[PDB]
Amino acid sequence: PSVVDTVAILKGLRDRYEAHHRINISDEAIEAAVKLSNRYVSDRFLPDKAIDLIDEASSKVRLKSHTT
Amino acid sequence: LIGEPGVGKTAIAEGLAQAIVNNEVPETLKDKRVMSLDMGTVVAGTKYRGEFEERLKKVMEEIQQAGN
Numbered sequence: 001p002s003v004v005d006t007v008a009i010l011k012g013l014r015d016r017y018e019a020h021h022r023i024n025i026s027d028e029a030i031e032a033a034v035k036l037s038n039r040y041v042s043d044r045f046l047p048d049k050a051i052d053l054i055d056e057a058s059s060k061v062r063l064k065s066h067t068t
Numbered sequence: 069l070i071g072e073p074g075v076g077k078t079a080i081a082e083g084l085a086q087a088i089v090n091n092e093v094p095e096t097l098k099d100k101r102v103m104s105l106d107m108g109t110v111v112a113g114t115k116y117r118g119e120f121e122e123r124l125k126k127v128m129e130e131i132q133q134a135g136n
């Protein structure tokens with residue numbers, strides 16, 4: 001999928017990942033994830049790597065907030 | 069875990085297990101069992117057709133049922 005299609009996919013899948021990670025994912029985060037994954041990640045393909053970037057960022061922020 | 073030989077990847081897994089035991093991980097992994105599987109053990113004694121697939125399927129079903 002193209003960049004715009006990948007952004008649409010991420011916006012569609014945002015609710016499930018927000019529910020799992022108990023956080024709120026911004027649109028600018030979606031755009032940045034797609035752009036950076038397309039530019040820098042090379043061995044993988046757009047939708048999967050964008051999803052991975054969003055999911056790992058959500059996991060990192062959740063772990064940082066929860067830890068106490 | 070990717071690295072050169074003798075860097076401590078198995079040590080990383082053991083440290084994760086010790087963190088589980090000492091309970092310094094998030095709530096989502098508080099009572100998880102870290103079980104080390106060797107594929108040579110899984111393939112042992114598997115002369116007839118379908119036996120390895122059967123063993124692996126039973127293992128996966130047990131993992132799904134346990135959930136921890």
Ligand SMILES: [Mg+2]
Nearest residue numbers: 076077078079
């Ligand atoms: Mg090792």
